[PDB]
């Protein structure tokens, strides 16, 4: 029972996994077993979703988060996001479920049976946290792996049937990407975009050519950087800037996952390109715009002149200007005029919403989509009663966008907390005061009084 | 094919439940570890064979 | 729905996604077995 | 002294709590209180 009590390890049971910091073999077990947990959930969850799935209802009426991910890759779906073949969903679920048994096998073996430390056994697989060169080497391997993952997405998009494209001319459809964006001015231009309204930083990506192109860059950057890290040791300025310890490295990764968690939250909330509204439901901005569109269509059908209709406030009841002059929907949805979506764009001209097009060109498919999106707004209760908070029971609906944004905000937040926890602990432990103040060497007692 | 398929899938399921309990118990057990390592190797190769069998038989029943 | 050949395994498929939660709870059964030492 | 180990009493007792609370949640979706 080597290091498996507090007396010998220094760590109580509730901090038991900290007992693993310098036991690379059992720690590899923990890590591989955990990767099996992730892969397991992905496979079991997909099969569960598929078993429950009624192909003719929207995915977003069915509490689905995984099938939508598979569909966006262009598997299983045709024009408009119509499901044409559930078999690719089945394949995805089963292959992960089977794969998780393999990882679970390796995890249990390393955790429970294999060498507790790897250093004696192997110098390639063994490691010392304080070995800066071995650390950047392992980091380099993982970077190469991630770079290959990014290129797998490019391979799907370009050579293995394309991706679902909500923006495809004539209507959403799977489309092969032949001209991915390679111009670094466009690709890296996204990273320098403001995160505020009408800009949206990288969340603004609105076409699959930029999406594919960005992953070409990212795949190459990761592979190059991974090679770089295998062949270099950290520079002196790096050495002096960081703490070099397992807990420190955990902390940096916790910060990065927290940041990524917040980014994903905003991505699923606003973006309707890599989270097609056909599969995930309308965004909050989209549903609010769709409501204004709905009533403009209705009332104009009744004979209203929607361009000249002054609302109670003096602003146009249906149509008004943005602060820079663009014609936009009126009422509260004024806030959402940055919204763009395939059912609305045909009505927008160089000056914003075009009154001529509004009066003459609104098609029944646009009326339908706007009614669907207005009535699937991502508002709903914790027990999945769809609608505003005062709604009566009847409609069992909470948008996949709300489930995904809320979950990831919670996770990202606690990951920031874990970052602070571990970053601060790693600093104290490196300097030797994580267990308390030395009563005979209390720093403040050697300091001059403040006053 | 449905007989072969459904037996092969039930077998895979059952062997899985056995391995799920048996592998950790074998790994953390003192005695009879020699008779265990063999069964684990046998179970594993059999588990893998059944997956491939179910995978192939799938297309004769779907 | 699952392809018809697998329908018999529907109730099993309904319960699998919860298994990860069980791994967390298992850690506590195990620790209780070793007296949270 | 005790013949039955404390970790088993805990595990069985905990599982019993999960079952009865599980049943109460099932009941939120069926019969009275279900909105249906």
């Amino acid at each position: 029972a080597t290091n498996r009590d507090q007396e010998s390890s220094g760590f109580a049971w509730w901090a038991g996994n900290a007992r693993l910091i310098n036991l690379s073999g059992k720690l590899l077990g923990a890590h591989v077993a955990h990767a099996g947990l992730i892969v397991f959930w992905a496979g079991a969850m997909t099969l569960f979703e598929l078993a429950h799935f009624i192909p003719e209802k929207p995915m977003y009426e069915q509490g689905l988060i995984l099938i939508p991910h598979i569909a966006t890759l262009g598997w299983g779906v045709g024009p408009g996001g119509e499901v044409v073949d559930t078999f690719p969903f089945f394949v995805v679920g089963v292959v992960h479920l089977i794969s998780s048994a393999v990882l679970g096998f390796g995890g249990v073996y390393h955790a429970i049976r294999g060498p507790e430390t790897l250093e004696e056994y192997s110098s390639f697989f063994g490691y010392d946290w304080k070995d800066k060169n071995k650390m950047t080497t392992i980091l380099g391997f993982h970077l190469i792996v991630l770079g290959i993952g990014a290129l797998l997405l490019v391979a799907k998009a370009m050579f293995f049937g394309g991706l679902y494209d909500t923006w495809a001319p004539g209507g959403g459809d799977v489309r092969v990407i032949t001209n991915p964006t390679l111009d670094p001015r466009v690709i890296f231009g996204y990273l320098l975009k403001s995160p505020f309204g009408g800009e949206g930083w990288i969340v603004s990506v609105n076409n699959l050519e930029d999406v594919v192109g960005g992953h070409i860059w990212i795949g190459l950057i990761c592979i190059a950087g991974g090679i770089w890290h295998i062949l270099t040791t950290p520079f002196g300025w790096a050495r002096r800037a960081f703490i070099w310890s397992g807990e420190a490295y955990l902390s940096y990764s916790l910060g990065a996952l927290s940041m990524m968690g917040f980014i994903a939250t905003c991505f699923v909330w606003f973006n309707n390109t890599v989270y097609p509204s056909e599969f995930y439901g309308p965004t909050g901005p989209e549903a609010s715009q769709a409501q204004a569109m709905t009533f403009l269509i209705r009332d104009q059908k009744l004979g209203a002149n929607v361009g000249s209709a002054q609302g109670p406030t003096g602003l146009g009841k249906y149509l008004m200007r943005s602060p820079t002059g663009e014609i936009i929907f009126g009422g509260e949805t004024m806030r959402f005029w940055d919204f763009r979506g395939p059912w609305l764009e045909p009505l927008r001209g160089p000056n914003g919403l075009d009154l001529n097009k509004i009066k003459n060109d609104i098609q029944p498919w646009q009326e339908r989509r706007a009614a669907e999106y207005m009535t699937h707004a991502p508002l709903g209760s914790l027990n999945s009663v769809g609608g505003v908070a005062t709604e009566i029971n009847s409609v069992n609906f909470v948008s996949p966008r709300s489930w995904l944004a809320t979950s990831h905000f919670v996770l990202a937040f606690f990951f920031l907390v874990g970052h602070l926890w571990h970053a601060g602990r790693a600093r104290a432990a490196a300097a030797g005061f994580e267990k308390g103040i030395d009563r005979e060497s209390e720093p403040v007692l050697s300091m001059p009084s403040l006053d | 094919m449905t007989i072969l398929f459904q037996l092969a899938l039930a077998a895979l399921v059952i062997l899985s439940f056995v391995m799920v309990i048996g592998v950790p118990v074998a790994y953390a057990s003192p005695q009879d570890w020699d008779r265990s390592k063999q069964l684990i190797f046998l179970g594993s190769g059999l588990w893998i064979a059944l997956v491939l069998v179910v995978g192939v038989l799938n297309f004769f029943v779907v | 729905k699952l392809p018809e050949a697998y329908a018999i395994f529907d109730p099993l498929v309904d319960v699998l996604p919860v298994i990860p939660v069980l791994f967390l709870a298992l850690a506590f059964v195990w620790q209780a077995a070793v007296g949270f030492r | 002294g005790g013949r039955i180990p404390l970790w088993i009493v805990a595990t069985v007792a905990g599982m019993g709590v999960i079952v009865i609370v599980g049943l109460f949640f099932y009941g939120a979706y069926a019969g009275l209180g279900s909105s249906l």
Partner: peptide, 29 residues
């Protein structure tokens, strides 16, 4: 309903069964 309950019943017992078997046999817990 009985089907899913039976499934989770034997899935649920598998974990504590592992610990029980190991404890009886004085395994490496």
């Amino acid at each position: 309903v009985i089907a899913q309950l039976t499934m989770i019943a034997m899935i649920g017992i598998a974990g504590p069964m592992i610990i029980f078997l190991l404890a009886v046999r004085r395994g490496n817990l």
